[PDB]
């Protein structure tokens, strides 16, 4: 274990190896950690657990810290596999230990573990749990941030906000605190996490933060369920979350596509040239969805004012990886972003129009599409380059 | 080179390494070959070329066989990259050599190579090209089998049908003829090819074969553009194509899904049990689309009377790999097949209904969906098992 502050002990698990989250839809290229906390005051309180893969390690490590029978309360901020996976193993040893969680958490905990006989205590925003020595826990409901059952737990005196998933990131490191790790890598993992997971709930982020700020609770540390404990200027990640939630965009355009004979790739590169020579302020990124990291593509979409998506026509429809990515973007609900579909075809085509419609269905404001037949010659490449110019002029944040 | 028959020389290229075709949408697990043929009678005729990766090897190997200036005619059955990729390199040495192809091939050849100054000769069904010694080429147009430009070339006397893509397969072997290779592996690669490439054009296969049969042309060998030369009972692959084109299905059900916490997987396995204990005649296959070979999944769909597709709800939509696969199936146009969508959800769900609709859009006859919340308990697994029973009864090819 590691001392977070005073009697707050980190009893979690580092994961140097993990690469796949949520099936294979989130790639953790820098590993992750599953943060669990044991508070030892007059009462002993366990906050969350860890991923099911480390269930036996978690309980054994917990035994080394404390007699399991001496644990008074268990707090479940969020009943996802990677935080509540070792719960069954733990409750098998101490089945009478009370669990404090939201009403929705009773449904999600019972939904996986199938042990409704456990002693649940529904908490709502403002509810308190005294743990002695003048300290108490204050619970804050945060539904759909990012699950119906989600909440945060605040510890008075020590002024530590146990935020669970919120403000966390998938970043594995031997050091626990934010000021002890690589700042660039930390930011990248934080932004990657928000972009790929929290984007659809951005409308809920600012009101909830505003609500919490109204509570006037001092914050010395933010202890999340993933990655570092924020202790040095801890509200920096809160400020980032406020920025990211406001339909975030930079002067940036992301271009991605799939291609069978590189015809659409040729179009994509020419489009990029047209943009770059029209608006020097715009940053451009290009990805082949079949050869690139999907989560990196989505992080760039999140960062972009607009996107261009390319596909050739394959059996009268679009290429499947493009269809898959557009479906996923539809779920993420990007806002105030623009889009244009492009691609090559052999005869009757149709995938470009089909893609433009689905981009619109995903919530993008659509500009005109760009089409070409077979491999673009010099004349066709000029048209693609002109398309990039036209797009750059239209999507300009400012004149010229 | 290798002697196919008499003065017909195989001047193609084996590809032991290739794993990706059409971007990454076709996995060639047993490599492939690109078959090109040089006929040396009174006239010298080159039939097709090879993939662009082996362009320099192709021309050099061709030089070792014949003075390039002595090549009289070039026949392009089909102007796809993997057959016309070395054409530019070749025509750079012999630019005056006439090219015989369909009208649509002029558009596809010029579409990639951008050399309209080449000497094209449009051929249509029944047209002939005398090459001396009492032998002639007879051309047969086969539009949308599988490209607009596609055709076949028949050589009289030797009775060899140069079928290009048709009846071919991605199977790399040192031996050239069908009777010299592993028969099981040959069948598997043949069926994999038809299922993943030719399925949407099945309605065109039987009429074209019937037309060709009416020509009463003797067939000693079928020399395709991929894999083996059919010399021993060569029409066996034609008979397979007739079977496969007739909305082919076996008493088989394919189940595939994606899952984040294995909840949908649990449903899939229970569904399979219900099927197996209801109808012993049905063969069942189960795939996780994120962990399986996509082309194998599609080959099984092709072989199946029906499918069940699983997804959990992810940000109010379906999992992207499932969305991608359903798009691809929409393009393949499977016929006379049934489907049922299933999956787990956390709260409001919606992906199962969404998937059922898109399966219907893909052309499947839909049965009722199966839904469950979080991880299925014993009661829920009984319902899933009952769903498999109900599906097995409904999709029964015969009573009981
Ligand atoms: C398997 C396959 C299916 C195709 N289906 C269509 C089609 O349905 N309609 C069409 O216009 N072109 C079709 N084409 C032609 C491609 O769209 C054309 O080659 C395009 O220029 C390739 O673009 P890309 O290199 O970006 O993949 C198909 C090509 C392949 C290889
Ligand atoms: C990233 C993520 C997003 C989710 N979005 C939804 C949703 O929008 N609606 C819903 O009902 N459940 C949602 N869920 C809950 C899952 O559908 C639920 O956990 C389901 O039982 C998982 O099924 P699986 O194990 O087959 O993936 C979401 C879960 C995750 C991890
Ligand atoms: Fe988490
Ligand atoms: Fe081919
Ligand atoms: O999580
Ligand atoms: O091909």
UniProtKB/Swiss-Prot annotation, chains A, B:
Amino acids binding Fe cation 1: 78, 80, 146, 165
Keyword Electron transport attached: yes
Annotated positions binding Fe cation 2: 82, 165, 226
Co-factor binding comment: Binds 3 Fe cations per monomer.
Presence of the UniProt keyword S-adenosyl-L-methionine in the record: no
Binding site for FMN: 259-263, 341-368
Subcellular location: Cytoplasm
Swiss-Prot/TrEMBL GO biological process terms: nitric oxide catabolic process; response to nitric oxide
Pathway per the UniProt entry: Nitrogen metabolism; nitric oxide reduction
Record region (Zinc metallo-hydrolase): 29-209
Residue span(s) of domain Flavodoxin-like: 253-392
GO cellular component: cytoplasm; protein-containing complex
Keywords: Cytoplasm, Electron transport, Flavoprotein, FMN, Iron, Metal-binding, Oxidoreductase, Transport
Induction remark: Submicromolar concentrations of NO induce NorV-dependent NO consumption; as NO reductase is sensitive to oxygen, no activity is detected in its presence. Repressed by oxygen in the presence of NO. Different effects on anaerobic induction in the absence of NO, and in the presence of N(O)3- or N(O)2- have been reported. Transcription is negatively regulated by FNR and does not require NarL or NarP.
Superkingdom of source: Bacteria
Cofactor: Fe cation; FMN
GO molecular function: electron transfer activity; FMN binding; identical protein binding; iron ion binding; nitric oxide reductase activity; oxidoreductase activity; oxidoreductase activity, acting on other nitrogenous compounds as donors
Assembly notes: Homotetramer.
Protein's job: Anaerobic nitric oxide reductase; uses NADH to detoxify nitric oxide (NO), protecting several 4Fe-4S NO-sensitive enzymes. Has at least 2 reductase partners, only one of which (NorW, flavorubredoxin reductase) has been identified. NO probably binds to the di-iron center; electrons enter from the reductase at rubredoxin and are transferred sequentially to the FMN center and the di-iron center. Also able to function as an aerobic oxygen reductase.
Family: In the N-terminal section; belongs to the zinc metallo-hydrolase group 3 family.
Protein's name in the database: Anaerobic nitric oxide reductase flavorubredoxin
Lineage: Bacteria, Pseudomonadati, Pseudomonadota, Gammaproteobacteria, Enterobacterales
Shown segment, full-protein numbering: 2 to 401 of 479
